């Protein structure tokens, strides 16, 4: 017969950092294998379509990377703007909304994310090039801003039809109903909730600034791609058992037949290095695609809605989420309701009044040791047990652990204070 | 034709010097040579008007085939992301 | 072959912690602090969650507890008598051994 | 082959973790996600490699 | 105008089995290719960072 | 949109009028008092 | 379509047809040419399966 019920709460904001896309590379098979060598290219032509297959695989990956970014961020029909006056019930969004004074309209948090993660083809060039993304960082920032403006000014309505404006405190009140907490909890505590939110956002900035490992997930993608290209360039140095790693020295020192044999050995080594690179890129691309699909799912369900999936949109009961862009990825700020300061109460399945068994409609029966009250489950708020708060089914002889307590009826209580005169 | 990863100056010099490996040449007027981050785009007229992306090029720039002041040609533009909608938010 | 970081005993301890939390506090522990609740009331809320009123559970609490206990016994009989039941995990082992 | 099968195992582990959070630490409204029927609750058990 | 409504219920328990992890192997590249052979190893170094 | 009269059956009461920011003044209709005042309305 | 097309490649061999290699050359040179074709076809199958 013992239940614990929260008497307070904390608004918590957490970060979830997900890769969305990876560097889009392109490789000139012939130039990589046969660096300005006619004899090598002519030998390379005898191996078949391998260069074509490698080109197609990398093209498919590059297209996939643009698809992944578009599916994660281009989820809004219109580019939404916040009102000129950034007053949202006392909730301070200045650290998530774009700062209009900068050359790139990014939020302070976005500036941090872009600064922590790190036409001259300076890096690893041997016929190996890097293609730009279809959407620029400014365009991604515009999609993120549109999503924030939509969520802040219209809640989830912009994600399932036209955007419908709602006062922000009423949006939060509905989110509270979504997690099983009545509207009066938020309205009575609106200043506390806004202050906890603003504090949590400041903590997000300090967490990302002071903990370099938080963004490791995105940095690792960059580092892995850099290693792949670095390795691929290093593979040109290897001899693979040939007389020399330099193709021009093979042609310069040896006669055509033996030179062709040594060249064929270099062709095998370089071609296998390209096949290894492409295979690793396809596996990594599949991993990135899965991450992008998860990020798009969390964009739709966490940002353009309210989710009842446990731990999907952060730890605690989900209230709302806000996207932020990052290099090659997305960071979600998940705002959740966390119960706090629980108290021990005695409980009972039902109240026995006149022999009828009374069950709560929306709540749990609790006792402070002297009186029975009905409370909401996620926030202690004692109420008088009445016939409106409860429903009746069966009698006191069926329910195990039923307790004897008075259920008050207003109508027969007021009849008692109204018709007593009998005249 | 998009020459990826290079400056339009380097490409223009390579055509005048006959240094490029492809043997075909794209007619240039100088009005149809536009420098993008993806590379040098020769044979398309860049316009200020933003449109929905059709044929992607890269770094925000897309191209399409449209009638220009009554005469059709390939144009390049910075893509539009969507219509702008300011929500009438109030207390 | 390198050993796992978490031993079979440590995995069992995490599983035990998860079972103790769910049984004694329902979903309150997943969302934050673990708040004790009588088990039949946790079930009453789960029934309400699926659209069945609380009185159905309380009126039929003995029947429900008996059906649960019988279902668990059936789980043991099913796993004991059907060697293929765990094939998904055995296949992983076989796939790695075959590869080596 | 190990990288491809590791990716398969990772996807399975991600599904198992999702089910752990939504089926064991909560009550799910997703049809057939946490078994057939209307979901009441779930209990994990350890198994070799899973 | 006809609807069917349950008058009773069954509590059902089902199993879901998921892989979580796979065997963590480790391979000594040099011993596998050129085991206990210096002469072979000196050729293995010429194939790059395999 | 489907407007209905605001009554004591449609709303719930918690707290006074000073704690909620942006509260407005409007009549909330109670069906039971109007009848019950009617039940002893003529006092005969 | 690509995998069948790979049968026409030489991969450094004199010809893509095993019967021409066997008919024109002596056994050990023919064996070298056949290994060149086997390596190419086997690599093509490994690519297809991956
Ligand atoms: C929303 O929160 C941000 C902080 O996260 C507020 O920005 C801060 O605003 C103050 C001015 O009110 C800025 O100046 C400060 O002034 C004091 C004066 O004593 C000085 O001691 C400080 O060193 C600082 O100069 C402050 O720099 C600024 N901080 C940031 C990060 O922008 C913002 O005003 C809040 N908005 C609302 C509507 O509450
Ligand atoms: C529920 O928990 C919140 C905290 O999460 C409680 O609000 C906090 O109450 C304490 C004490 O009343 C405040 O500390 C005081 O702050 C003033 C600021 O000027 C300072 O001068 C005092 O010396 C003291 O440090 C704290 O700031 C406040 N936090 C917030 C965000 O408002 C709340 O009272 C709790 N409610 C219940 C019913 O337990
Ligand atoms: C709803 O279904 C449950 C079964 O899932 C019904 O309970 C079952 O009722 C039958 C007949 O009353 C019980 O069988 C009898 O069991 C006694 C045990 O000593 C035996 O001596 C009899 O010969 C007979 O086999 C059965 O055990 C019982 N099952 C459980 C788990 O209690 C229940 O009555 C159904 N309710 C309605 C309203 O249909
Ligand atoms: C349980 O709650 C009731 C209701 O608040 C407490 O009784 C009230 O106590 C206040 C003083 O704090 C009195 O002014 C009220 O008149 C009391 N009301 C009634 C109906 O008795 C009761 O004391 C609480 N019990 C415990 C153990 O805390
Ligand atoms: C709740 O009240 C009922 C009476 O309305 C109690 O039932 C009585 O319990 C006494 C115990 O000595 C018996 O002698 C009576 O015969 C019972 N009467 C009936 C009609 O059941 C019941 O025990 C009370 N429960 C609690 C927990 O106090
Ligand atoms: C709702 O009505 C109450 C009166 O029933 C208003 O309260 C009065 O407000 C005036 C404002 O000048 C004060 O001078 C009175 O002393 C207040 N009286 C009481 C009893 O509070 C209240 O302001 C009204 N609210 C709105 C939003 O119109
Ligand atoms: C192209 O070169 C000129 C100088 O010749 C330079 O000013 C310009 O910025 C370069 N453009 C790009 C895109 O690198
Ligand atoms: C409830 O009572 C138990 C008694 O052992 C105690 O350990 C626990 O901390 C109490 N919880 C609260 C919230 O008071
Ligand atoms: C909303 O309330 C704030 C309170 O500070 C006020 O400054 C703002 O102008 C109000 N907005 C409207 C549209 O009334």
Numbering used by the authors:
A (entry chain F): 710 to 827, 849 to 1153
B (entry chain G): 610 to 679, 689 to 709
C (entry chain E): 860 to 959
D (entry chain E): 1010 to 1059
E (entry chain E): 710 to 759
F (entry chain G): 1110 to 1153
G (entry chain G): 960 to 1009
Please share text taken word for word from the publication where this structure appeared.
The JN.1-sublineage KP.3.1.1 recently emerged as the globally prevalent SARS-CoV-2 variant, demonstrating increased infectivity and antibody escape. We investigate how mutations and a deletion in the KP.3.1.1 spike protein (S) affect hACE2 binding and antibody escape.
In this study, we used single-particle cryoelectron microscopy (cryo-EM) to investigate structures of the apo KP.3.1.1 spike and its complex with hACE2. Two RBDs were found to be in the up position, with each RBD binding to an hACE2 molecule, while the third RBD is in the down position. Compared to JN.1, both KP.3 and KP.3.1.1 share two mutations, F456L and Q493E, in the receptor-binding domain (RBD) of the spike protein. KP.3.1.1 contains only one additional change compared to KP.3, a deletion in the NTD (S31Δ). Q493E alone reduced hACE2 binding, while F456L by itself had minimal impact on the binding; however, hACE2 binding with the Q493E mutation was recovered in the context of F456L (JN.1.11 + S31Δ+Q493E vs. KP.3.1.1). Thus, we also observed the epistatic effect of F456L and Q493E in KP.3.1.1, which together enhanced hACE2 binding, compared to the substantially reduced binding with Q493E alone. Furthermore, a KP.3.1.1 S with hACE2 structure further confirms an epistatic effect between F456L and Q493E on hACE2 binding. In this study, we demonstrated that KP.3.1.1 retains this synergistic epistasis.
